[PDB]
Swiss-Prot record, chains A, D, G, H, J, L:
Disulfide bonds: 6-11
Protein name in the entry: Insulin A chain
Name of the encoding gene: INS
Residues of the full protein shown: 90 to 110 of 110
Transmembrane segments: none
Swiss-Prot record, chains B, C, E, F, I, K:
Top-level taxonomy: Eukaryota, Metazoa, Chordata, Craniata, Vertebrata
Location of this fragment in the whole protein: 25 to 54 of 110
Annotated phenotype, changing residue 24 to S: In HPRI; Los-Angeles
Domain of life: Eukaryota
Protein name: Insulin B chain
Organism encoding this protein: Homo sapiens (Human)
Length: 21, 30, 30, 21, 30, 30, 21, 21, 30, 21, 30, 21
């Protein structure tokens, strides 16, 4: 999920926008 | 946008602003 | 007016501490 | 939702926990 | 009104940086 | 509630919300 | 206290240091 | 104190409430 | 009034995430 | 500046990026 | 003032309050 | 710069005020 994708590793804005609804 | 690890409340706040009036979901359990 | 945008960041920060691993959804739409 | 019940008046932790999963 | 609850979080955050190791007490009661 | 280490300003903010109109004391020196 | 002197007007670092221990 | 109990190690809500006044 | 001091902290926090390594200048003076 | 255009109304990421370097 | 490492948004917020109406510059690229 | 002086190492208030404008 988000912790693994964005905290453990880095997330581009497009990727962080996958968690918008 | 910023290019670094965003954890805990800094991830929630990054979500809050990126998403705008769409809102988001924060699901940390894995 | 007052400011529900500034209040919303505080709100999602508060929900990160209260919900913990249950996570949440923030929808200012109802 | 939460913006109209908790930005117009103060919400305790307990009132905030209602909006969790 | 304005919002002294949202202001209070900013206030205690500001006091964490200013007081450092002297610490503080936050009492909105007087 | 969240089940993780809360340090610096994240501890002050967790205190701020947990305690409500009671207020709190932040004393980091030990 | 601090809520009535610093939320009604801006308080500098110096005014905030008065409420430390 | 609080740093040692809640930052070095983890604090339950009851324990964090020991630092309320 | 409303509160542009409390809004300014949110503003510079938002700019830290948006600008990343380009950095910024915050001047409430114009 | 930013305080009068973004505290009086909401500014998206895109409107905020205008004030970067 | 606090005597510890201040990183990311905690550095921007320390700047925000220290500087007051003077404003500041945040330039993280080196 | 600031990251190197204030995040990698620690900054006194005087030093952090070098980054005020
Ligand atoms: Zn942090
Ligand atoms: Zn705020």
């Amino acid at each position: 999920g988000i912790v693994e994708q964005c905290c453990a590793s880095i997330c581009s804005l497009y990727q962080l926008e996958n968690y918008c609804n | 946008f910023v290019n670094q690890h965003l954890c805990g409340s800094h991830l929630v706040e990054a979500l809050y602003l990126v998403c705008g009036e769409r809102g988001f979901f924060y699901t940390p359990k894995t």
